[PDB]
Design a protein around this ligand. Structure first.
Ligand code: HEM
Ligand code: HEM
Ligand code: HEM
Ligand code: HEM
Lengths: 145, 138, 145, 141
């Protein structure tokens, strides 16, 4: 249920987003704010504090990879489930990530968009992005069911 | 438990809010009402429309209690001990919806203080809002 | 995505359930165990205690109606989303029931099934019903997206 | 965070569990592993099949901790302190998982003690398990 305005708002803001910077910032903040999530990223090296996590090149690279696959979905908002079908099998079967973590990461992303857009990130614009976040988390949980 | 840098960050961040704490409290509520309509059912006797004076007034109360809590990070369960009985026992608020308001407050702060909303401060603010939440639930 | 085995287990166990009694027990326990849900049923009268709640004639009637629509959905486990479409609009658009509450209710139903079936409700049997809970909650939360 | 009726319900219900505390803890784990497979990753080198001696051994430790918590309902932060550090800092258990284990324990109790598991006792056991969970995640917080 992406409304016409939802689609329009989400497409506009994503155009203005620097994916590499939002991605690294997003994954990094997930790791700092929600420490248990570091269990899935043991091989990335030192994740002991805000300073270590945010300057970590592997965290930067990987968040950029996260965020770009999200950008794929924005081109095709009506079939989020399809787009994320293989990443679902990945995060579920291989990585064993609990689905609640998908909502946590999406909420961190919303706060990173807020930082970037400031007063442009109105309560209405945020409501559209919360829908996107919910939709994405849903699509990633799909191979859990 | 909150580290010394956590208390320092929370107090720093709340100082950067300046004179807009009431305003930011009201915007967090309004954000929560748009993104999460389920929270509106806790306010049956409120006008919740955009620009509402009741929302504006309630934001100042929330911001006041938060300001009060920041002043007493060391013995928080006590400083909010009064509020804890009202939310948990009387209003009966889902311990889950405290996360929604916490998210919306952080989004509001991010949107208004981008320079101040560093990762470290974001983590400190999140632990702070979680501790507040647990106090209002436990 | 239920497995066939899950569908068998759900269908077989549901056939031995008295929908009336499990329905009232389920809604009663939800209201007692999670008092915030009482807010959505302001019209129901005396919910001041476990005793009053479990004995409240409106609570029983309502629990019956709720679990009856679950039974009707059990006939088409491949299409829960389509079945609960109208109910999803009702709970979300009109009542503004938090989607997390949908899981709570399913979890309470699971315990009620455990009370009724005893050791027949094996860990394996429970796993199938948890999928059912997840599927119902998701079909009902659909109109949040 | 409990009440006199609560404390009484918990103690009565937990005392009906009796000689089977360990067994119920192992069954609760098994229910969690099967219903919520992601929780298996916390036990990489355990035998997680049914009747596993490692799970039996472990269900016994959980139940002991619960038994101790019941014996100190009023000072739970003190009683479960080392477990708190263990689950948050060392094992880094996702908070979500505590809710899942709690549900599985309630199911086990419901399945074994149908007559004891009244709505009021069910409410008490839930608040008790929620409290235990809160303490176990306090290092996050
Ligand atoms: C919006 C939510 C998410 C999106 C779009 C997403 C997307 C991705 C993508 C595109 C990859 C690359 C995989 C490949 O190229 O083969 C990946 C890998 C990975 N994801 Fe995510 N993910 C999400 C949520 C999460 C969360 C919340 C966690 C952990 C709590 C997580 C854990 C991982 C890990 C550990 C890897 C790589 C494992 C390795 O280094 O080999 N994901 N994800
Ligand atoms: C950091 C979190 C929160 C803080 C600091 C907070 C603070 C407050 C304050 C200061 C009041 C006014 C008390 C008075 O002066 O009478 C209040 C009342 C109330 N709050 Fe909150 N609150 C929080 C979270 C929530 C959440 C998440 C909800 C619902 C989703 C909620 C719902 C209510 C309701 C329904 C009232 C009573 C309204 C009335 O009768 O006028 N609160 N809270
Ligand atoms: C498995 C999940 C659920 C199912 C299958 C279900 C089913 C139903 C059905 C069939 C109705 C009848 C409406 C009508 O007759 O027109 C209804 C109404 C209602 N539901 Fe649910 N429900 C579920 C979960 C919940 C939950 C968790 C709540 C939490 C508060 C809730 C709150 C309500 C309320 C307040 C009504 C009002 C009906 C009246 O007042 O007559 N429902 N539901
Ligand atoms: C819900 C209440 C829980 C209680 C009372 C509890 C209690 C315990 C106890 C007593 C131990 C043994 C600690 C020792 O060595 O002294 C332990 C270890 C452990 N627990 Fe828990 N626990 C709980 C929840 C969980 C959950 C939800 C998970 C994960 C889903 C979990 C995963 C583990 C792991 C991986 C170990 C170490 C096992 C090993 O490798 O030896 N626990 N817990």
């Amino acid at each position: 249920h992406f409304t016409e305005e939802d689609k329009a708002t989400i497409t506009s803001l994503w155009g203005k987003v620097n994916v590499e910077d939002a991605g690294g910032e997003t994954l990094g903040r997930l790791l700092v704010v929600y420490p248990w999530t570091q269990r899935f990223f043991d091989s990335f090296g030192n994740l002991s504090s805000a300073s270590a996590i945010m300057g970590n090149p592997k965290v930067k690279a990987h968040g950029k990879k996260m965020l770009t696959s999200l950008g794929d979905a924005i081109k095709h908002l009506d079939d989020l489930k399809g787009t994320f079908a293989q990443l679902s099998e990945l995060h579920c079967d291989k990585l064993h990530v609990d689905p609640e973590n998908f909502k946590l990461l999406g909420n961190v992303l919303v706060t990173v968009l807020a930082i970037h857009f400031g007063k442009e990130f109105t309560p209405e614009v945020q409501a559209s992005w919360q829908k996107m976040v919910t939709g994405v988390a849903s699509a990633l949980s799909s191979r859990y069911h | 438990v909150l580290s010394p840098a956590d208390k320092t960050n929370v107090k720093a961040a709340w100082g950067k809010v300046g004179a807009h704490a009431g305003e930011y409290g009201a915007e967090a509520l309004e954000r929560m009402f748009l993104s999460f309509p389920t929270t509106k059912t806790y306010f049956p006797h409120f006008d919740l429309s955009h620009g509402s004076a009741q929302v504006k007034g309630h934001g100042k109360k929330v911001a006041d209690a938060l300001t009060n809590a920041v002043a007493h990070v060391d013995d928080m369960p006590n400083a909010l001990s009064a509020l804890s009985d009202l939310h948990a026992h009387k209003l009966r608020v889902d311990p889950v919806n405290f996360k929604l308001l916490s998210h919306c407050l952080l989004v509001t702060l991010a949107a208004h203080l981008p320079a101040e909303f560093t990762p470290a401060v974001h983590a400190s603010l999140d632990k702070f809002l979680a501790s507040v939440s647990t106090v209002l639930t436990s």
